[model samples]
Target: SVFSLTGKKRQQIVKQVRQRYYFQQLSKTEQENYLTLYDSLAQFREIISLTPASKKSLIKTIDAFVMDNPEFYWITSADYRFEFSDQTVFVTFPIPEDAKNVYQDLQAIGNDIVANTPSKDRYEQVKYFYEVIIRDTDYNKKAFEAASNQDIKSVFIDHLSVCNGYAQAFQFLCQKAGIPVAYIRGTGTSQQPQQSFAHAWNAVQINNTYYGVDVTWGDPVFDNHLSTINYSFLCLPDYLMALSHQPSKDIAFNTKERFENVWTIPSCTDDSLLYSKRHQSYISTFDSDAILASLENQLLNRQEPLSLQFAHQDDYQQMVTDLTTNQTGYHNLFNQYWNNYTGFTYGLLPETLSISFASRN
Candidate 1:
């Protein structure tokens, strides 16, 4: 029960560790595991009793741990394990396994990214990590179809994964940077039934406030040919996210307050911090000129792909027609736009009335 501390007390320890001048100089494993153990306590709500066996059994146990700790995105199958007997147990996620060297390399690279992040501020930490995940990883549509696509290592090493892997990786990097985040499990629905399925995303705490992040939706993976990312899902308040995401009725999930001084779950009411506000032309209007204006503006100012949404299928089809067809009448607009960019991708999900756009050079 010693490790079973409430979420607030755990954050206190994290704050203390961060306050130490040379704390960032500690071993990568040291900083990573500290937050991992703390997060496990908050999620599991009990001291974990790890049962050990052989290498074969060990991998199984590690998978079980990953399943249990949905928040630990950094450690994948065969990348972490526990040394335990009938009585006591200890954990380690450092050593690289034979084929698992990729996992180790990913951890090293991610750690460096977190280390070099300029500010110690929590909001910036969350923001930078979110950007990195969206920029670096691609949603694995193949894995999403297969039942086995559920680990952070795949997202990190292979650069592909479904919502599960996306959420895990976000949580993993956020923890390493000393930011508290949680994984949320729920179903996604769409105007098209085939698009509906179980979905995973994250709930992050910044300065005692909670917001939602759907990196999977953020990545603009709907059309594989396009390279697009967006900020619509970044740090969204509960009210805004209610337009699409539905938190489960489980006690832990439904409850917003669990600890003193650290409201584990607080309503995310702030939109001033959204990525769109910081970047002009982050939004798109229905008209072709407006859409083109937004796209050209992004290319001019950010030189990055533009991300946007539409209100209805009519608007979406109109916008698509405008882009791909001849100004006179027609040419495959999708093809035209696809040919114009090195990357163009978007996901249209009617469940939340959400449509996303992204294009790149």
Candidate 2:
């Protein structure tokens, strides 16, 4: 009942790329099927006919194809019945008009987004878009049951979405800027809050190495009454990423349980490019004098909130305690440098073992 293609509207429905990052991983036959499926899906034909492969991995590849291609955010129906006959696997991916509406709207929306994205380098593009998604998109609290909440359309068009939405938007934007990033869906466990839930994030390739960036966790929405980007999750290595995010095999597709797809991520081990490392945010010991001197220099020059990572968890805890409970550790330095006001505020990103302090200006 949904798809009645008019020439005017049909031109608007874009056929996305089949030869994406995930496409290279599939076998040749799978690649051929991927493109064929993409072409038919773009046509909005009620029934897309295909030569069924004996291989079971085809279904997994389709999920990867959809997850890899964010433009098809309109494939919003799980009730897409698949009938099996000896000759063909009948395919009917029901497309709602609302999905087409979003499909049309996102071209302008995505173009402007990529246009405005800053790109001094690939990493800069990665970080800027990381800031962009969390800065604008919030975790949807109103409609937990809505499928739109988990789609990129929710983030781009409505400024609302869940972990899946944030991760895919990051992947899509980075891909537009000619960067390599993959979508990862999995379970996220946090010890401080003592909770665990299904989550999604991205792994971006930078200078021959992959790094994880979880925009959903980096957003300041949950804790910061003051709006700021949590730098803790940006460009982190695999060990650090594993602290909270655990990659899973099954992706969170637009239509849940429609089919289980293999979700894999490249190992991110290089730490040299991490935000904390590149920016010199990690400290071996909480030397008050050195800490104050660095903080004062950054604040005096009007820098963004600085994230300080400690090698030891105990040191991390103590760093927070001294700066807050025992302000004298930094108060005396404030006397030396920040004489304007001896006050600042701080927050923590549990995964990175880091604390962020901003001048109370």
Candidate 3:
């Protein structure tokens, strides 16, 4: 049974790779070699953005370059990755070779997104952009569970990335669309009030008002699928963010006054204090009651969230009864997981603790 499962998994990877490389206009051999390396090796960010400017006149040029040469491109960092696509394939990561990996990723993604994703206003476009990103990447559960990092490409292929992978991927996608995006990282409270951990999420600027977006928790895959309406991924301000998420010093870009007034991040000389504190209210259930509880139970070796998604309101009671009767940790779990698995990342992707977003002013 295990062997069969493994075989199935390999076949799935091959199929996914074939589709990904071949979908764009590329020669048969290029597609073959691309898939060969894709299934075998890395997703180098530098390589993806290495095409000569004149050569990159069309989308096919980018696809062919990405598929054929993994040499010209380079890895920007251990945690960032990129992809190239236009309105047709909907490329999520667009790390340009010219800029920093993070900035390039966001710039390319935003440029393409702003161009392709049309909304009645900037607000709608930003909202739609996030929803699409959430729809594309997975939270990095493997790293969190193993306390390690995967290559950028590994995160892509797995379709389950950490907070950084998801957020970076989102940033890359947004940059492609020409939308201005800020990569905000911060800490927040979890279910356990005493247990605050290193966290990262995003805050997007919609009409100059910053709103929040956390892709890691939002792209959950351990026990079951994470829902869209879960508080962990909802839009909120800095004051509300202080509940469980925290940003690393390198990522702490918010002003002291603003941070104090909104997020209320604690003042500290040493960054080591970030992990010493535990903020998620494990018992109190402040913001994320249902979903967060489910994660805690899983971490503690308890039963996984029993997902009972019902289409009608009338089925709610029965679903709850069934979930409780079955000892499932969660109630209705009704969300779709869609993303390109087997993409690229820097070297080993960074072990992302959290992903936070800030609104652009």
Candidate 4:
């Protein structure tokens, strides 16, 4: 037992490294073994140890370390040997010479992101990184090998990545910013084509609790390589994420019975920072004049299309009636602005209880 000083002196020592979620789940010995193997893998050293722990311990440790440390994108696998007589497994992970520069590149890129982000608030840090990754990266359908589209190098260096890279890059940068964030693996289903596939995202800790931020979905790629910031999936609670997202079976395997365990995904019940209200576009009740003025301000002054989220179905339906049930049914009221915008039509994204405006021409 290592205990010397008392009080807050120990707190600083314990918190020197930012808290890693998965690493905290392991038992004390398991944590020590994890740190040992972590150092070995990080330094490209081989034949590190003869373990007293079970095979599952080593297996869990490696995946846990990787889950906690997304910057180690070049680490593919490990080579290990188990001795039946002594009942121990020796592990080795050789480094690929070609991948040596990945460590430096990740350090440079991650440090740069943290330096540029001036905000200390977790909410703004998450938002800034979410928008940064969405703005700079491209969703590559052609998964060229594994690392080409599934790693941070693809995001920071080449600006091309699949969802995996998007999630990892976000995780790594946030970790550097000293904000607690977790990489999440899940299955995401889209409504337009209605397809479910393996997906990756993040759970960012804000205001002493977690909230979901799916950066991949926030960046929607369109025809001719066009894309835009879709805020439908920004900072939302678990109930909303559950509508279209589910944790991977591996991650959720034993969570329900032991949700208090750190191995499971967080409940993510915070919605105070949801972008709809933050953008001043949420309609909670029927106030037509105020709503119209806000819409006009965003559309004309901001030079952006008006998108609004409704808090209640009653309010959303009534507002639709208030805005566009028929000609002279407030279409004329909007036409003064809408027609001048040269005829823009609107559609509803029912999944999010929100409306979107687009060019009618």
RMSD of each: 10.4, 5.4, 20.9, 5.5
Q: lDDT of each prediction vs. the true structure?
A: 0.55, 0.69, 0.37, 0.68
lDDT of 1 at 62: 38
Stretches off by above 4 angstroms in model 3 are 1-76, 79-115, 118-120, 147-158, 186-189, 192-194, 222-232, 250-361
Which lDDT tens digits does candidate 1 get at residues 133-213? 878777777666663357766667777677777787887777677676666666655444445577778877776767788
How does residue 223 of candidate 3 score in lDDT?
A: 19
Q: Which ten residues in a row have the lowest lDDT in candidate 4?
A: 251-260
- What is candidate 3's CA lDDT for residue 208? 42
- List, residue by residue over 1-361, the lDDT tens digit for candidate 3: 1111135645664554432311344454334333433433334332332212221222333343332221222321222223434411212233445434533444454455557776646545655655665666565555665511222332333455565555555444443443444444555444422444555555554544555556555444621223232223444444334434665433211233111222222222222112111222112222234433434443354322222121122333343343346422221211111123222111100011221111112
True-structure lDDT of candidate 2: 0.69
Q: Write the per-residue lDDT of candidate 4 for residues 1-361, one digit (tens) a residue.
A: 1212235744443453337777767776667666665555566665556357665665566667767776666653233333433444566555567555877887897898888886867778889999999899887866622355777878898899888888889888888888888888878865555667788888888868998889887776621111267776788788668767887635331224212233578679867788878877877777777677667767665544577876666776776675465424335445666555445567665445567665457
- List residue ranges in candidate 1 displaced over 4 A: 1-106, 118-124, 192-194, 222-227, 251-266, 280-361
Q: List the residue pairs that clash in candidate 1.
A: 226-343, 226-344, 226-345, 227-343, 227-344, 324-333
Q: Any idea what lDDT model 1 has?
A: 0.55
- In angstroms, the error of model 1 at 232 is 1.7
TM-score of 1: 0.54
Q: How many residue pairs clash per model?
A: 6, 1, 96, 0
